[PDB]
Paper text:
The endoplasmic reticulum (ER) Hsp70 chaperone BiP is regulated by AMPylation, a reversible inactivating post-translational modification. Both BiP AMPylation and deAMPylation are catalysed by a single ER-localised enzyme, FICD. Here we present crystallographic and solution structures of a deAMPylation Michaelis complex formed between mammalian AMPylated BiP and FICD. The latter, via its tetratricopeptide repeat domain, binds a surface that is specific to ATP-state Hsp70 chaperones, explaining the exquisite selectivity of FICD for BiP’s ATP-bound conformation both when AMPylating and deAMPylating Thr518.
A complex of otherwise wild-type dimeric FICDH363A and AMPylated BiP readily crystallised, but despite extensive efforts, these crystals did not yield useful diffraction data. However, the introduction of a monomerising Leu258Asp mutation and truncation of BiP’s flexible α-helical lid facilitated purification of a heterodimeric FICDL258D-H363A·BiPT229A-V461F-AMP complex (see the “Methods” section) that crystallised and produced two very similar sub-2 Å datasets. The crystal structures displayed (identical) extensive bipartite protein–protein interfaces totalling 1366 Å2 (state 1 crystal structure is shown). The second interface, by which FICD’s catalytic Fic domain engaged BiP’s SBDβ (671 Å2), contained an intermolecular β-sheet between BiP’s Thr518-bearing loop (ℓ7,8) and the Fic domain flap. Contacts between the AMP moiety and the FICD active site contributed an additional 306 Å2 interaction surface to the deAMPylation complex. The state 1 deAMPylation complex crystal structure contains well-resolved electron density for BiP’s AMPylated Thr518 residue within FICD’s active site. The phosphate of Thr518-AMP is coordinated by a Mg2+ held in position by Asp367 of FICD’s Fic motif. The crystal structures presented in this work provide strong support for a mechanism of eukaryotic deAMPylation that is acido-basic in nature and in which Glu234 aligns a catalytic water molecule in-line for an SN2-type nucleophilic attack into α-phosphate of Thr518-AMP.
Numbering used by the authors:
A (entry chain B): 28 to 549
B (entry chain A): 103 to 442
The structure:
Amino acid sequence: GTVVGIDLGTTYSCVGVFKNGRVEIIANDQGNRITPSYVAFTPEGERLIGDAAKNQLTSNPENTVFDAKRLIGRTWNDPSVQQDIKFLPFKVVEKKTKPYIQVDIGGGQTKTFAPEEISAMVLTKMKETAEAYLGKKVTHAVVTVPAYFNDAQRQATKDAGTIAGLNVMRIINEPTAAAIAYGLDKREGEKNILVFDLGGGAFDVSLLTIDNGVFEVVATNGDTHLGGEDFDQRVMEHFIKLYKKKTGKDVRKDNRAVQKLRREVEKAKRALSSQHQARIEIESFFEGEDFSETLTRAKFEELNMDLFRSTMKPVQKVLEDSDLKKSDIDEIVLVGGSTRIPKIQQLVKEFFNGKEPSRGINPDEAVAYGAAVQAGVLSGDQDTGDLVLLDVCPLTLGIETVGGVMTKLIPRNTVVPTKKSQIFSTASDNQPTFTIKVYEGERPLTKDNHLLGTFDLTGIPPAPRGVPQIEVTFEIDVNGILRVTAEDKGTGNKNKITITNDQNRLTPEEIERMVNDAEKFA
Amino acid sequence: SLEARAALNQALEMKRQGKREKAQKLFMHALKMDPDFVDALTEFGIFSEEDKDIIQADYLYTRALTISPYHEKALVNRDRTLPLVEEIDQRYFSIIDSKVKKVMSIPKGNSALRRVMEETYYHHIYHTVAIEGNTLTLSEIRHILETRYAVPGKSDEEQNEVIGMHAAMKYINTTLVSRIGSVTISDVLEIHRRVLGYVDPVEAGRFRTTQVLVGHHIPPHPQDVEKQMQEFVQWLNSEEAMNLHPVEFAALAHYKLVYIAPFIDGNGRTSRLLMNLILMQAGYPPITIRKEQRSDYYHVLEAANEGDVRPFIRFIAKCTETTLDTLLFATTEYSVALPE
Ligand SMILES: *P(=O)(O)OC[C@H]1O[C@@H](n2cnc3c(N)ncnc32)[C@H](O)[C@@H]1O
Ligand SMILES: [Mg+2]
């Protein structure tokens, strides 16, 4: 059928379709071209997704779920997860060392969801939005991820797609999608573009060389836990503290109070992008008492200035990685809802010595637009011509070797897909196994890098220590996802080396159950 | 793959513009999307030929034609590069032949050659066991063979591999190198019996009865080993083989034997010994495939598996030149001049 492009955002999602040589961004049942990444369960047992879910947040906060994009592919322990918990009204519980969501689904029946299942529901709503417009069922999608998403976050997004009953034909990096939206109609030849992508919860900077349908990522750098959500948290925390200073009342107890403040903080932040102060008014805020405060643009900026200034570091990083001057940048492309913030536009403009950003780029829709184009290409039946993406892996991949050493195999900014092989050996006589610990990061010791996964390699034949020649191969596919394989390079019996997948990610049996659970609401 | 096609089309457009770095990236992307993409292999060959890399151009045209034997553009291209590659490969053999004659031109009053040849012998045992993962140092190997004393805190297996190699080389140099007549299966078994004799005296000097793997290579079923070894030794003693350049003869002898992999173990050690028997019978010094070349060695063997043995022949040729260069450098005499 029709392959759709879905921007699966932290706060909002957007679906587009490529038909008759152009992109249509599809309005949902409420006429909105962007859909809140929200799900909710009513006391009656009705599953709400999108606007309906977000609009009952303040009356049912404990059983309203959002921010799933900042939970997928992370540990329970993650300081970033613990930060968000303080501002999330729903129970986040540790299950297999990962943050699961526990909600009352109705009739005093509690269900515990993987963050992948929440994102699956959001993807289901975006699919339903497309199906309503197309008047035919949608089975295939291109889904976007932040460029700086690690292996686990990418796989979790694919898994969310699978659970939503979608064939995810391709995971596309959000800034690369944005570059396609900018570059498709342009026939200007070779250009260097800086895509600055500050969305609801993730920040990416990608430097691309675009050239008459070729989209070449030169360098990428970002932060998968920096965006609109963090700016809202800073303002919420400010006003929760101000309330305790004024009244003595700690409002962190009342979830309805905290989430009422969240809703009004979002409205205020949006207002402050076109005016210099916003009134925050809440009736029956805490213990039947009213809230009334002014937020100035200056105060909003002060509360977030460290975070705003921090967005310049990845811009500096991609220029350094690419060995390009500021003057080599032909276009600055601002995408993600948070690039509407005047101070963000000002910091980028001043970094590039007064250079204005590209005109006619809707920062809320550009990522979905690009996803829709790539969906059209992979559909194979949309006459899209010779569009070629040459994307890169965002993180250096390595294997832990004796002494907790980061043995680097694939450097950051390597074009994907890619393959790297290296021969390793045993640390003791007749060692029958490798515990292959794959790390993401730059540090020479793995303790200072991020564990991608643990892979059990079995069937190493008996031999003295350091004698076996076990080739370990890293393959990064076109989705940016790692496969680990191994081969004895020596003479051996017919029984090849076996690698068992990491046991700490969702198995096919777990995904099958989550798929079957999701199908019931079809 | 429509994706692969798009990448090749863009590769050709960027090449036309003179954006050769981008063209190369796009060719490589096309061949990642479809490794057996015949149009992409052929056009990437043209790209190599434009950069005056005739061997790589010909490699790609030949690879294309193994997939699609009647491919018009690949046939025309291969027909052009075939004689050019023969000229290039033969020129390298001529350079190697000159350097062999340079080694033989060393005066018999040269003091350095005697000691260098002795050192090189122990270097040969080090490299042939080390390339297979043996952890013994050159000094440890010298100690094992000169003294016969066991090195402490090292496996019996690794030491028994070295003792076996010493026994095998002594047998070859004293019985086979100077012997008149055909090289038989029985001769190869006698070499293997010494190679593996101290590690595995049960398997030493007999063909495997089980299926083995050799890295990525799947050798014949054990029941087919005798017949393939008979066909191998027929080729070894053929006038066709005798008419090859000794480097090509020795390289093909090595490859043909490890392809069969007739033994449970020691196929590489035995094949490298046979390679050097052939070179030494042809009047060449024995050559070394260095421990550090392990990864390159496996790559060109895999290239041979995939249907082009020439990268392996060229690899063995370069090992031969390196051996000759090292021998000539090590035996250089530095002249004393009168001020005048
Ligand atoms: P086993 O220890 O008996 O033999 C090892 C030798 O086999 C050769 N070899 C390695 N990899 C290949 C491939 N891919 N194809 C053919 N022969 C191969 C080398 O000579 C090893 O030393
Ligand atoms: Mg072996």
